[PDB]
Design a protein around this ligand. Sequence first.
Ligand SMILES: Cc1cn([C@H]2C[C@H](OP(=O)(O)O)[C@@H](COP(=O)(O)O)O2)c(=O)[nH]c1=O
Ligand SMILES: [Ca+2]
Length: 130
Amino acid sequence: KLHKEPATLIKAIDGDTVKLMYKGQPMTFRLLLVDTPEFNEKYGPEASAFTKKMVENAKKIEVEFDKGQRTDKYGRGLAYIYADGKMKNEALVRQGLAKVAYVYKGNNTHEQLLRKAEAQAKKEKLNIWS
Ligand SMILES: Cc1cn([C@H]2C[C@H](OP(=O)(O)O)[C@@H](COP(=O)(O)O)O2)c(=O)[nH]c1=O
Ligand SMILES: [Ca+2]
């Protein structure tokens, strides 16, 4: 079992990174288990727009760390991020705006949930799968 913790928005960055205040400190978070296109790539802008809209409209942002590493080699927090109870990581995949990616042993709790969303986005031919 994982736990949701509070955080507040500082600023949207791109499809799979965001700046949040967590335990009172500014931190850039990278979303576990996904990969969005870079802003400069196809669907990059749409991914960035999606994440921005989702976080900027939320009344309540939460951070959920997995079992394993909580920061990556660049000092980014590694988390599942929720906006008003909806997971951003899963939402991007379900929409065909991210691929399931970077699945490392022991930070992979929600792997099967996200693959199931990817299968459905691919069936629908959405965005990246179009
Ligand atoms: C998502 C994730 C990325 N990373 C590192 C792997 C990649 O190293 P490299 O920079 O050497 O390619 C990079 C991809 O992040 P980005 O897709 O944001 O560039 O971030 C992790 O270490 N753990 C993770 O859980
Ligand atoms: Ca990326």
